[PDB]
Amino acid sequence: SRPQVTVHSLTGEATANALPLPAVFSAPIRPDIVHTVFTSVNKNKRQAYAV
């Protein structure tokens, strides 16, 4: 089954209602591809400069 993460209230106390993991957290964690994608995505908001 899923680790059954606990839902918390706005004011401290952990409500006894639990939810399963959405299975997106079990995806592979690849710091290398997230690196290369970030450098290209972060260049999509550049304004052109020229003399």
Place this chain on the structure above:
Amino acid sequence: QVWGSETVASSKVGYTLPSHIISTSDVTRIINSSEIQSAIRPAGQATQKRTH
């Protein structure tokens, strides 16, 4: 719903969650568990004694 699971597909067309090339992230557990330890030769010394 947004990324999908083994039940709901993706809610995005033609998309699936990525697969793993290795089933676990702890290589030490695989080596020590039951089967590799019975098929491997005995270990060395982790540092060779300087001879001559």
Place this chain on the structure above:
Amino acid sequence: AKSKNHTAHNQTRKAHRNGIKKPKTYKYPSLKGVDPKFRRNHKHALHGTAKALAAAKK
């Protein structure tokens, strides 16, 4: 102005940095230049000897 027309100097030294290699002979060499009449008969000779061997294992 004249120049050096030709010399064989350093040519053997260059050839021996990657020294002289044989043409890497193989079994069953290429049948190029063989008599076509012989190859025409040899083609049908290999065809028939692959039929008796195939018929020997039923």
Place this chain on the structure above:
Amino acid sequence: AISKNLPILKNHFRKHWQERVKVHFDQAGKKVSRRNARATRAAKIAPRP
């Protein structure tokens, strides 16, 4: 000029092409304009489709 095996390229850049370079920086800017034009049109052409 011709060496080092490569497909023969046909690049038509022998004129003053640098004077007629059009870079579409306004692709995001004009897209907002089309949506703005479509929005301000629909109010003027009340509820026609």
Place this chain on the structure above:
Amino acid sequence: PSRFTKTRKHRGHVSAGKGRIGKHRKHPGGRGMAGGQHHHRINMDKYHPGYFGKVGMRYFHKQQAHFWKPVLNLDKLWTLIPEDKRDQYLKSASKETAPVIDTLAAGYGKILGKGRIPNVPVIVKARFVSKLAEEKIRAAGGVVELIA
């Protein structure tokens, strides 16, 4: 990234990787395809055979849509059928319920007989077919309906 280029590694070296006798100039051998028949012939022949001259007949005002004829081999012939209904036709091979495959709607003009098909009667609607593509289809109990 200019920081990974060899220009940064050439800082301090006089010739910058171009040599002291060569003395890198503007255009030592010409511009573009210059001298393909005079001083680049050894490169034109040997790695570009056939560059000079004409062979065919001219075609004035060629429209590529006139020669539109995508080919589909007998290899698949079933990816055009959806995967959900593919299995229920394979394990129920029989006439009077033969699937109708319109290869024109899928974007194909001619059917070619490269692959081998299972022994299932299949109705094929195509503009063109190969000679032995029809033979393999008819041997399996199918027919080809010529369309336009």
Place this chain on the structure above:
Amino acid sequence: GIDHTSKQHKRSGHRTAPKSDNVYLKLLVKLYTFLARRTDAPFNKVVLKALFLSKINRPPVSVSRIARALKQEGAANKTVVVVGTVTDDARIFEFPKTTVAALRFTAGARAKIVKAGGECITLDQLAVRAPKGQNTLILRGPRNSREAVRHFGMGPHKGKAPRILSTGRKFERARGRRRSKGFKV
């Protein structure tokens, strides 16, 4: 001074580590480095070296290529090992139940094997099943079927796919290609 016969400080020229930065691939390299060192099995040394290969040195293996290998004599129960990506082939219609081990599986290929009762296994799960490679069979993809291989070794009287952008009439077919215009190649 020493009269050197061979080149000094000459590296072996073979990959000792993967060129990639994949953390999960390095775990498989770490797992198989231990196996290739302390098991004395020749299977573990082949797999470890195959993990170092590049993308063009790891051609995809079709699921149909697996089925042909399983039709050999006494090979129907041999575990198929592919160091690379296993791709789906729709040209086949019958597939056996034999387990297939690979680095990656495409959506069609993984579904095709599981539908036929087979099993998709990663290379780490094979280590606990076959530490020395019991009852295995290694399958590699074809290397010379690549498009870049066609232009390799081009020259006169070779027929080795001249590098061209546009193909057809008027593109490198007249002088040096037929007897009519001077000579043929």
Place this chain on the structure above:
RNA sequence: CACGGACCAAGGAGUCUAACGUCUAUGCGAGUGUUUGGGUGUAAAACCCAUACGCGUAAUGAAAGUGAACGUAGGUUGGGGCCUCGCAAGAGGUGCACAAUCGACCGAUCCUGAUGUCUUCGGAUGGAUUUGAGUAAGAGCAUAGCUGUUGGGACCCGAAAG
């Protein structure tokens, strides 16, 4: 006893782009490419998407056109690994990729011209020291990086001219 350099400070020379080759990394994979555009938005970002289109999955001929299984998709030789036997050495079996070679199939070319024939149409079957950038259980597409190429002012500075 060839040229530049009296001295000091700052500035000062392989860059960018279009199209590409090899190699490498990544994603998907007989497919691949969201960003022409549309939807949406915390507003040049991010996120989502239809239909087409590009390349690839078929080639070959000047063209009309035709168009890749006699067969466990072939035989032979070498083959990593695996399997069986063995105390081991070795022996046998199976042998992917790759290498060499002989065949098969597709197109072109040169011949052979069957049943049928609006009597000149039709091209079955069989070949050929011929030929193709082919088939023979697909590998490509996209992005990024180094290097290299071509056009651009094109590493920087320089003419006599027009």
Place this chain on the structure above:
RNA sequence: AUAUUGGCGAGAGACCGAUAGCGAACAAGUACAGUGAUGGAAAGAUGAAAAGAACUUUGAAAAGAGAGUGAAAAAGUACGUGAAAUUGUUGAAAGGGAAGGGCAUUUGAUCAGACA
């Protein structure tokens, strides 16, 4: 629907930061040159506030020396920070037609380490 180095009104930048960026951050198309068509610069920074040094003394005067202002005149309208070439003074050392350098040590100067 499309174009837009001009004009007007706006919002921005992985752009340049006074030999850069428009030729021009300043009384810049200004000073200035050419008969003329045209050519065409250099030049930003005291301090928070002038509080920009009253007054005394020497000198013909400019200024100097005190005093004074200020957190700082090592901020005084030659003004933030003030490098190098080059120059003065002081101190140290050396020098028989160059000087400078390398290895090694003497001598002088200077610095360092650690108290079971």
